Design a protein around this ligand. Structure first.
Ligand SMILES: [Zn+2]
Length: 46
């Protein structure tokens, strides 16, 4: 999935666990997953 940089302003949505932010919820909701049960491997997806 090769895409560019979507034109989005500030981010109204701000995570509650850490305090992150995102222009769209879909981006945040998927982020919270990082907190929900910490894995041994860790968030790398490299
Ligand atoms: Zn967070």
């Amino acid at each position: 999935g090769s895409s560019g940089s979507s034109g989005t302003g500030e981010k109204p949505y701000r995570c509650g666990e850490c305090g992150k932010a995102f222009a769209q919820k879909a981006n945040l909701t998927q982020h919270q997953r990082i907190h929900t049960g910490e894995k041994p491997s860790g968030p790398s997806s490299g």
